[PDB]
Amino acid sequence: NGILSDKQLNKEMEKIIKLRAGSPKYVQRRLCLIISGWDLSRSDYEDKYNIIMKNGHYEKAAAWAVFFGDIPKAVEILGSAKKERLRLIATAIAGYLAYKDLPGNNAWRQQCRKMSSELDDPYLRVIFAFIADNDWWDILYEPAISLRERLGVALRFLNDTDLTTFLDRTSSTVIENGELEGLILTGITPNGIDLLQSYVNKTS
Amino acid sequence: NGILSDKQLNKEMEKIIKLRRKGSPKYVQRRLCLIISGWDLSRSDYEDKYNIIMKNGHYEKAAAWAVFFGDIPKAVEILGSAKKERLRLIATAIAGYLAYKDLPGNNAWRQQCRKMSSELDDPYLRVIFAFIADNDWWDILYEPAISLRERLGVALRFLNDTDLTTFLDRTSSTVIENGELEGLILTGITPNGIDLLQSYVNKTS
């Protein structure tokens, strides 16, 4: 949201990226990716996949692969897992790559929608809800997944016209609800102190 | 194999067919084999049998029979809304084939289906995955864990006569020496059936 001059703030934001376009506000997106911890490279993406897999969380690695758009990598990661249910889920996700050219409206899309509705694991629910009717607004609005991982796809795979609307709605939600994950948006600003005050009022 | 005139036995066998009437050359023998094996049932009675198998609780056998009779969307509908989540996952995997059968092959989805066919314990879903991953019946006709009556049904329904004769010869020569009691569908209660029962008595007492 910006805020001594506009060119002055633009150049001090630029010098942070010039320490370590395609959009009207590109350097702000880079700074928001730096703040949210979502400026990892492809080799860093593979390292994060390996680290997440090393804890036994295969579903989290598949969700991270889908979040960055590497759906065949999610197929590979959930393949050769330690669970038969995970292998069935991997086959279901693998039944999308040849399907992306289709207009849709299949009974398979209805099966994926029902499975995303009935599943208890939030990451697999994210995958099955994203694979059928492939839009990003069905993933970045639920509260089951972390707000950091939601901003990992809102700042990366979404445009600045609706990004300000999403950020405004999420900030207005977390200020009055008092969720500690709103500190992604507000930081430790005085608005962050207001968020913490609502958190103290709600939870002591 | 057949074996006093050929035309007279053919016409009385056609009369045998024309008893319950309320593109192959051997249609006066395939229909007799379907009568003998119990696979000359109507489609409404097929729906009734699907309801019966679903009411018995064997959803995997109902899915296998739907795959055998070809209505793969009905297999998806039967395996969906079942008592298990695993069956729903299998239904999603099965449904991932209808918009996929035009693909040339050697892709990761078919590799995953072949891996699932290799690893899974249920034989009905094993042959379901074997038929879904590759559209060939020969991985289904030689699976021993499924019943031989179903295999003969899907051999008389979908096979050329030059291949059905080889399948019948192979399966009969297997079940005569192996002593399998389900070879009596192929051989009948004949002297060769007595040879089958003699081998069964030798193996099992």
From Swiss-Prot, chain B:
It comes from the Eukaryota. Transmembrane segments: none annotated. Disulfide bonds: none annotated. It is found in: Cytoplasm; Vacuole membrane. Present with 184 molecules/cell in log phase SD medium. Belongs to the WD repeat mio family. Component of the SEA complex which coats the vacuolar membrane and is involved in intracellular trafficking, autophagy, response to nitrogen starvation, and amino acid biogenesis. Component of the SEA complex composed of at least IML1/SEA1, RTC1/SEA2, MTC5/SEA3, NPR2, NPR3, SEA4, SEC13 and SEH1. This is SEH-associated protein 4. It comes from Saccharomyces cerevisiae (strain ATCC 204508 / S288c). The chain holds residues 578 to 808 of 1038 of the full protein.
